[PDB]
Structure formats: structure tokens, C-alpha cells
């Protein structure tokens, strides 16, 4: 009343194929990594965002003036 | 001159075995084993000698003797082995015992 087999399983698995892995640049979360480096990275990202806002404002002013 | 066979250590053990070891070295140990030599009349059996060079003969005596420079084996740093020629032989030990 208890039987085990692996007969049809490979065919079933390959019907809709073995899907490949997600590219490494996606779902690239950093949670659980080394905290001392994580904190410094966060500070640098904040500075970068401020810089991007300033750059856009400068672009807008230049286009308007000339 | 470094091949001069000299006495290194003399150990005396008393085995009571009921409900003791001691080693002596230096100019004191030479003063000892004079009582043993006198008691044995400067005469012991040939089979008492051992192939290494040591020998011995209540308190049981045992004297181990060899050339100098055997530190290269008991040294901690850069320990090595002493040459076989520099090791003392049974016949040489017997000759030394007869001479002294």
C-alpha cells in the first residue's frame, strides 16, 4: 500500500521546461549583509539623491534662461 | 678532544613497591659511585654493559655516560640527531671503565 517511483517525473518536469535562474542584477537585496558597510552605503546613497535633485534644478534653469 | 667520554647522569632507584627516584649530575655524582665501585671491587660482569653505553648494578645504581655535544638532540629549537660515530659504543665504554 506504500510504493515509490521516479518514473514519469523527469518528463513532467520538462513539459513546461526547467526555467532558468533570474538574472543576478534583479532582486539584488542587501538585507542580512555586513552592517558596518551597509550603514556607510546608505549615507552615500542619501548624498547621491541630493546631488541628483540639484543637477536637475540646474538643468531646468539653464534651459529656461537660454 | 671533544670525543672525551665523560659521565653525564647517575640515577639511583629503590623499588619498595608497597603502600622512589633520584638523579644526580655534576661533580657531586662523581663523588658518588665511588662507594659503589668500592663495594663492587671495580669488577662487574660483562653482560651488565648495554649496547648504548650505559650500565648499572637495596639501592640499584645506573650510570649513563657519553661524549659532549648531545644537546643537538634534547634542544628545543632546531633539534636534530647526533652522529652515529659520535655516539658511544659498548666496547669504548668498557675500555673507559677499565681505564678509570
Amino acid at each position: 500500500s506504500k510504493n515509490h517511483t521516479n518514473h514519469n517525473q523527469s518528463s513532467k518536469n520538462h513539459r513546461n521546461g526547467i526555467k532558468g535562474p533570474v538574472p543576478l542584477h534583479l532582486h539584488n537585496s542587501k538585507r542580512g549583509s555586513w552592517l558596518p558597510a551597509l550603514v556607510n552605503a546608505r549615507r552615500v546613497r542619501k548624498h547621491n539623491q541630493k546631488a541628483a535633485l540639484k543637477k536637475r534644478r540646474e538643468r531646468i534653469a539653464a534651459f529656461a534662461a537660454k | 678532544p671533544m670525543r672525551e667520554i665523560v659521565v653525564k647522569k647517575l640515577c639511583i632507584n629503590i623499588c619498595v613497591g608497597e603502600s622512589v627516584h633520584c638523579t644526580v649530575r655534576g661533580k657531586k655524582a662523581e663523588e658518588l659511585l665511588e662507594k659503589g665501585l668500592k663495594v663492587k671491587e671495580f669488577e662487574l660482569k660483562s653482560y651488565n654493559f648495554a649496547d648504548t653505553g650505559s650500565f648499572g648494578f637495596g639501592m640499584d645504581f645506573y650510570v649513563v655516560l657519553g661524549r659532549r655535544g648531545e644537546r643537538v638532540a634534547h634542544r628545543k629549537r632546531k633539534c636534530s640527531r647526533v652522529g652515529h660515530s659520535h655516539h658511544v659504543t659498548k666496547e669504548e665504554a668498557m675500555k673507559w671503565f677499565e681505564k678509570v
Binding site: 555586513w34 | 629549537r77 633539534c79
Partner: protein
């Protein structure tokens, strides 16, 4: 020792066969944090032969260790020592000279002068664990670490020179295990050679009643009371002209 014995036999490393290296200690000595990506890390090698003292600053590498500075006890004649070359005072001088040479090479000299004099006291070393000083760790090799050894004399010399070697004063001569304190006066006595002077004086008091020890010292006019000034002059010359 049959043929099978030789067929299955793994030889040890070469420098373990010759009995020069303790690899278990060397691994933990060169090991560093992996989150540092190979920042420079130096160790202080102190080796004492029968008639010489060698002290060098070493950095490990895959191709082989690289040496940054090196001091020897036989360069002390150029500064004014010609008698001991092995005792505690010689060790202190060697350490101080090595530290001065290394700081002069790095150019960080004139910023970390350590202590201008010697007192035998213990002052904590400043480490990251105001600009920080050069830092190295101490490798004593296979030597036994007992209180009052010469390796710790070299260490004290380097620390007084100005390097930052972490340490505790549990192995300096004037240290009592029960009292858990240090005797800076005893340490200064041993640095400047009071023990050598006293032994020489006793030997000169003897060896005259009966007519090898201190043969050259006695042949020269080395009076047992011309030692502390000699060592102070040696220190001043070393600090003045390390090169």
C-alpha cells in the same frame, strides 16, 4: 621501516623538519580580517642567537615575506657599545634603534618621539581597537616567554622608541605575580645594567684572592661603575643619528 613504510609516508614542511617555524602560530599571526581586502599588516621578529640579536619588521606575502627594516646588535659598536652585545641593555638598544630607523624611513619621525628617557613604567598603547602611531605585533618564535626575558626588552626598547606594539607589563622583570604590580626602579636597573655591574664587581673582588668570566671586560679598563653613563650616551647618539 619496510618498503611499504616509505611508500606511505608524508613528510612535514621543510621548516618544520629543520625545527625553525611554528606554523600553527604563524597562521594566526598573519591572519587578518577578510573585510579589509589586504591592508598592510606588520609583525616584529625578535631572534636571539648565541652571540647576536636580530630584530626586523616583516610583512607577509604569497611569494615570500618582505622585510622593511632590520637592526642588529653588532651595529652598536658604531654607537658606543663594545662589551655586552647580548644582555638586556643590548636588547633595549637594539629595539630603540630599529624603531628609530623605521620611523625615519616612513618619514613619520619628529611626530612620535615616544619617551625621551627611560623609567621602566608601563603606559598603555594607543590603537584603533590625533594621528595614530605606527603599529606592529611581536613574534617570539619558539622562544619561551618567561618574566624578564630579553625579547620583552627588545619590545620595551621599540615602545620607548615610538612604535605602538600592544602589550601588558606581565613579563617585565620588576613584576610581582602576587602583588600584581610593577617596579619601574627594578626595570630601570636592568635596562641600564646594574645586575651586570654588580656581577662584574663581585668577579673582580674574587679572581684576585686566588691568583674566564668577563675576560675582555676585565682586560679593558671597564670599571664596574662606568656603565649607566655609557648607556645613556649610547641612547642619545642613537636618537641623534639613527642612520
Amino acid at each position: 621501516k619496510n618498503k611499504a613504510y616509505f611508500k606511505r609516508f608524508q613528510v612535514k614542511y621543510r621548516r618544520r623538519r629543520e625545527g625553525k617555524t611554528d606554523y600553527h602560530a604563524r597562521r594566526q599571526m598573519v591572519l587578518q580580517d577578510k573585510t579589509k581586502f589586504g591592508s598592510p599588516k606588520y609583525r616584529l621578529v625578535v631572534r636571539i642567537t648565541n652571540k647576536d640579536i636580530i630584530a626586523q619588521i616583516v610583512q607577509a606575502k604569497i611569494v615570500g615575506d618582505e622585510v622593511v627594516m632590520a637592526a642588529y646588535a653588532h651595529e652598536l659598536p658604531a654607537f658606543g657599545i663594545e662589551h655586552g652585545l647580548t644582555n638586556y641593555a643590548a636588547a633595549y638598544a637594539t629595539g630603540l634603534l630599529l624603531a628609530r630607523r623605521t620611523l625615519a624611513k616612513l618619514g613619520i619621525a619628529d611626530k612620535f618621539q615616544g619617551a625621551k628617557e627611560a623609567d621602566g613604567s608601563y603606559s598603555a598603547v594607543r590603537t584603533k581597537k590625533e594621528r595614530f602611531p605606527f603599529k606592529a605585533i611581536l613574534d617570539v618564535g619558539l622562544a619561551r616567554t618567561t618574566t624578564g626575558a630579553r625579547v620583552f626588552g627588545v619590545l620595551k626598547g621599540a615602545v620607548d622608541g615610538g612604535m605602538a606594539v600592544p602589550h601588558r607589563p606581565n613579563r617585565f622583570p620588576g613584576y610581582n605575580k602576587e602583588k600584581s604590580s610593577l617596579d619601574a626602579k627594578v626595570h630601570r636597573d636592568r635596562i641600564f645594567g646594574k645586575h651586570v655591574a654588580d656581577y662584574l664587581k663581585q668577579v673582580k673582588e674574587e679572581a684576585s684572592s686566588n691568583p674566564v668570566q668577563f675576560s675582555k671586560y676585565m682586560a679593558a679598563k671597564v670599571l664596574p661603575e662606568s656603565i649607566e653613563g655609557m648607556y645613556k650616551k649610547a641612547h642619545a647618539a642613537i636618537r641623534a643619528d639613527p642612520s
